[PDB]
Design a protein around this nucleic acid. Structure first.
Ligand SMILES: [K+]
Length: 173
RNA sequence: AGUUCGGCCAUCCUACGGCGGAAACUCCUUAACUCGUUCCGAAUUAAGAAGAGAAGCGCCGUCAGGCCCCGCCAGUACUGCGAUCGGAGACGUCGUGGGAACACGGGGUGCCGAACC
């Protein structure tokens, strides 16, 4: 559901400063209306330009090619009930937006932090040798094999319409 | 440049060093008359022209105190509207608007209007 957007903005031009500077950002958001709001949240803190005093020049939407599985490293900050913290996370996904979906669900589940509690500092691709987290690194290898981690899930699902049967089914492994 | 009468009432004030005076303003000289000092010609009232740039006044100066403008401080402190956001609470968070002060660093240091020499 996440999407990559590039936003340009600038302070409204005046007599003291004709041709103000242009600032660009990369944003991940579910749509164009949330993305432009998040651009004004940062430009107000980092550059002290409220939304009343500036204008947005573009909301570029960028669609990425998948088809191969890469590593990503996300540097972010979030807020808990006792303060603010920094954190680095690693994930394997096919596009950057999909890697941000995975991050937001792990923050929501293990830290209970929602979307507006989180500021993304950095998102970059990480080559296989340079990985630093054990979970990701296991799969950055040649020849990884494991048996199915939950084959019971197949059997139960079929038993939701086939409510009564004549023998208890097996779980092939 | 100067004197009398004013407007706005320190970018004009206060302190200490300087520099100036043809004219002008001042300081200054006098106790007959006028009038005056809880005592005193100090002040003030009258009458004058020997002397002055020592003061006041105008100008210049000072890592000067004050005062005045700008930037920073800072989209920080605080706050209007909305929330079946978090927390035992005290309190905090997010969305959408408004937005300081102290401190700090650089600059500056009266102008306008009538009449006369
Ligand atoms: K003098």
């Amino acid at each position: 559901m996440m999407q990559k957007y590039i936003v340009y903005g600038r302070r409204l031009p005046s007599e003291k400063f004709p041709e103000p500077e242009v600032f660009r950002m990369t944003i991940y958001a579910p749509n164009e209306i949330v993305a432009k709001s998040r651009f004004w949240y940062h430009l107000k803190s980092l550059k002290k330009i409220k939304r009343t005093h500036g204008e947005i020049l573009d909301c570029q939407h960028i669609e990425e090619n998948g088809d191969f599985v890469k590593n990503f490293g996300v540097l972010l900050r979030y807020r808990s009930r006792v303060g603010q913290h920094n954190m680095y996370r690693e994930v394997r996904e096919t596009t950057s937006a999909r890697a941000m979906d995975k991050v937001y669900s792990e923050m929501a589940g293990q830290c209970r932090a929602r979307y507006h509690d989180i500021q993304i500092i950095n998102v970059k691709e990480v080559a296989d040798e340079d990985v630093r987290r054990e979970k990701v690194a296991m799969f950055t290898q040649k020849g990884v094999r494991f048996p199915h981690p939950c084959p019971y899930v197949h059997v139960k699902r079929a038993a939701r319409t086939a409510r009564f049967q004549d023998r208890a089914p097996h779980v092939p492994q």
